[PDB]
């Protein structure tokens, strides 16, 4: 109940929300059916429109007008945004030449440069270039300020998940807004785009920027604007708030526009009808900047122009129907569209089986336009699994397509020509970032970056300590003139042991054999040096990774590679090696095919054994440093050490062998040498974080050898490829992956073909940031380079996407 008998007189767009049944006058009351009776009359005035004209100049104040052109309007803070232009011979902000803002130029009483976040829905990255002719205000922000060619949204590339990721710095799986539609089984409650349940606070996790600000004594404007408040009024309201006395005035503000998304759905991302919405957005930016100029704030305020996701061409005729695959179609609930989420229709139905549903959805049709996944098997880069609201069964839909349960859902629910929600690496889903103001750099282009990073920077801009989040604080220091965040490297927690030769061959009873007993102070003194680390400078280019958790491990040196061997998990945490452009690929000699050799530096009790692999009929083994890339016949024996061995399903060995035999050398040829760090990952609870020993669900049969869920590789070289990887004097270049360690290749529909037709495609899908690997392993890489730490943080957040040019 709301007793709408109170009055909005003097309270229009009040910043504090009064508790019902008192009538509200804040910019959210419309959404709650709770505004006072006179809200429209007093607060949403429209008389005379939004612009001054020559004849309105110097007028007698008429409080009925939407905005004002009387002499007192500046001190009242309520002129139309073009007042000084029309009436005082001033120029529009866009017509003024760009001039560097070296320091904030603020009116007295401003404690800090205000931040204004100008967010636009569905603003695809390529609009900056393709619509530049009709967006002069935005183009001036872009060219004069700091801009990225695009900004990567989070998956799914829908509105609420992305705006709330912008606000919190968190992945959707952590903030809880995992789609536009959700069922939470603990609450037994549903979240819907239209409706009231979405307002309940239990949906919204983490700590968004406005709460972070408020708790730290920085006042915030309201972030949410009710749909019926027009854009002009939103701008005028912000400008009025900026005229409040110092003690009442917020330092952070948001504007939101439902365009160009709204039209993009109806007309497609590049429909000719799209020119008008882009023009109108630009005019709104113009009004803000002219309004700030009138208030003398245009060289004081930091402005962020940011989108939530892009827009793709999608029509009704490109819909896959689950009724063309499943017999049991009515026993399931599907969340449909540009992704799919499946669960049982009834929890009382014990005939429901996810395994048979996945199977009936797998590679069933030649050009099938979605791929089914159990959520823990999705690419780790999506970070889309660790939430009870994310259904166990997921469909990744190809760009340009939809999935639906049955045809009736599509024609009884062509209308639309555009949609979004696809994999966040898809070019059409990319969106925009521009930063303009005293705290941003001048005329500066920065590399593309993820929207999870912005919360940290917005906190930096407001002098706030960010709540714990998924950004990597410092990775975006290069956007900022000042207010940078200068992190220290994490402290290493566990120091390695450096074992020498401590065990005789006969102490080992591992059931392993090698044809190696084939026998000189030349190469004998030489091999001792290699085991002591004499080539370590070649194979360990960026220092050894730090171990950020308590564990027991040994550094093992070899001619061709170096490893950090875990005595707890019985295998390396990491293996590091460098392959030059000149390196040659050799095969495994016939006599060495099944050779496995005890490591005399490492006790039998802390070793794997070959008998366990023999007895385990599902599990085979591979090697982290590949025997194919050995530098010499003698060095090759090192690659068969039991300490270089890891458990691998035969299906996965197909993938791994092709990577090691074919792809590493291809990369070294293309990149002028590469340094490779590979290792296992254990993430059985799919939280994107390293498992402890007691979280491991699978071991090699009859043993304490844990089975990795994933294998990673980090591949590093010189950004200036005229320099070899091992002699690089400047910035680095990286690509990484986290491959799921699966006992089948069902993910790859062409896997019956030669690895050359399907393996690289799989690896591209599972591209990763070094940072993702850090989380999954408790390791910290690039500890010893000649590069600044912030530059290394940027490198660690880099994602190689394999998409064409934007
Ligand atoms: C991205 O960044 C984020 C943010 O930094 C990282 O997420 C953090 O990870 C931490 C480690 O997992 C986690 O810490 C746990 O917090 C527990 C208390 O949590 C509450 O309080 C915090 C702080 O205010 C709050 O943020 C939490 O909010 C979560 O849950 C609510 C309600 O469900 C949601 O509204 C909200 O969206 C958020 O949900 C997300 O996180 C939870 C996990 O917390 C998931 O379950 C959800 O799916 C969703 O993703 C909470 O309100 C604390 O109790 C934990 O401590 C347990 O474990 C430690 C182990 O060290 C142990 O010492 C304790 O004894 C305790 O164990 C006991 O509980 C176990 C399970 O009940 C039980 O098995 C044991 O026997 C014991 O009884 C733990 O410290 C932190 O909460 C989240 N924060 C957020 C916001 O998500 C995230 O890791 C990053 N991702 C990547 C890839 O890097
Ligand atoms: N009610 S409805 O019309 O049926 C339905 C309602 C929900 N709707 C719908 O998509 N949204 C209604 C819109 C009003 N919001 C808004 O003002 O957002 C501003 C904002 C948000 C986050 C920000 O994050 C930060 F911190 F800056 F990084 C900043 C600014 C966005 C809402 C999405 C779809 C239509
Ligand atoms: Ca949107
Ligand atoms: Ca884990
Ligand atoms: Cl959704
Ligand atoms: Na086996
Ligand atoms: Na297959
Ligand atoms: Zn949309």
Curated annotation (Swiss-Prot):
N-glycosylation, but not furin-cleavage, plays a critical role on secretion and on lysoPLD activity. It is an enzyme of class 3 (hydrolase). It comes from Rattus norvegicus (Rat). Its EC number is 3.1.4.39, 3.1.4.4. 1-(9Z-octadecenoyl)-sn-glycero-3-phosphate binds at residues 159, 180, 261, 420. This is Autotaxin. Ca(2+) binds at residues 683, 685, 687, 689, 691. Disulfide bonds join 8-25, 12-43, 23-36, 29-35, 52-69, 57-87, 67-80, 73-79, 98-144, 106-300, 316-414, 363-749, 512-610, 514-595, 718-728. Abundantly expressed in cerebrum and cerebellum. Localized in secretory epithelial cells in the brain and the eye including choroid plexus epithelial cells, ciliary epithelial cells, iris pigment epithelial cells, and retinal pigment cells. Zn(2+) 1 binds at residues 121, 159, 308-309. Residues 541-806 are annotated as: Nuclease-like domain. SMART domains: Endonuclease_NS, NUC, SO. The active site is at 159 (nucleophile). Changing residue 121 to N: Abolishes lysophospholipase D activity. PANTHER family: ECTONUCLEOTIDE PYROPHOSPHATASE/PHOSPHODIESTERASE, ECTONUCLEOTIDE PYROPHOSPHATASE_PHOSPHODIESTERASE FAMILY MEMBER 2. A motif (Cell attachment site) lies at residues 76-78. 1-hexadecanoyl-sn-glycero-3-phosphate binds at residues 159, 180, 261, 420. Inhibited by vanadate. Inhibited by micromolar levels of bile salts, such as tauroursodeoxycholate. Not inhibited by taurodeoxycholate. Not inhibited by hydroxysterols, such as 7-hydroxycholesterol, testosterone, dexamethasone and prednisolone. Inhibited by EDTA and EGTA. The keyword Lipoprotein does not apply. It comes from the Eukaryota. It is found in: Secreted. Changing residue 265 to Q: 20% of wild-type lysophospholipase D activity. 1-tetradecanoyl-sn-glycerol 3-phosphate binds at residues 159, 180, 261, 420.
